[PDB]
């Protein structure tokens, strides 16, 4: 078996699981208190996965490409302050994905309100 080593010396029983969930909830509550006006997470893009065994499943992405941001009516530098993730190393290939990302960005822009600097 895979126990010829001194495995007994490193056995971390996950007793923290019960407390880890509460700690994560408290951290989320603290972030909400600090980030009250804004959502706890940034607006992530919709993307299609490689590895055809999973490509049939649509999933979220890291950040919108510069072309998508430009087509969305704003700039990458300005979009960051609005909570929109931007990926400078992602290149759009599929047209449907680009259209979906543009529509999502437009919906987010229409649904957001920005407070005055005052």
């Amino acid at each position: 078996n895979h126990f010829r080593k001194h495995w007994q010396e490193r056995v971390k029983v996950h007793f923290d699981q019960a407390g880890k969930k509460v700690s994560r909830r408290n951290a989320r509550a603290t972030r909400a208190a600090k980030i009250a006006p804004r959502p706890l997470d940034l607006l992530r893009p919709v993307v299609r996965a490689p590895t055809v065994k999973y490509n049939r499943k649509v999933r979220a992405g890291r950040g919108f490409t510069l072309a998508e941001v430009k087509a969305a009516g704003l700039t990458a530098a300005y979009a960051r302050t609005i909570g929109i993730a931007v990926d400078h190393r992602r290149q759009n290939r599929n047209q449907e994905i680009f259209d979906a990302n543009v529509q999502r960005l437009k919906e987010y822009q229409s649904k957001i309100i920005v407070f005055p600097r005052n």
């Binding site: 997470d41 979220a60 987010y108």
Partner: peptide, 8 residues
């Protein structure tokens, strides 16, 4: 903004 994990 993202889909909520689990139920609601």
């Amino acid at each position: 903004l993202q889909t909520p994990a689990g139920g609601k």
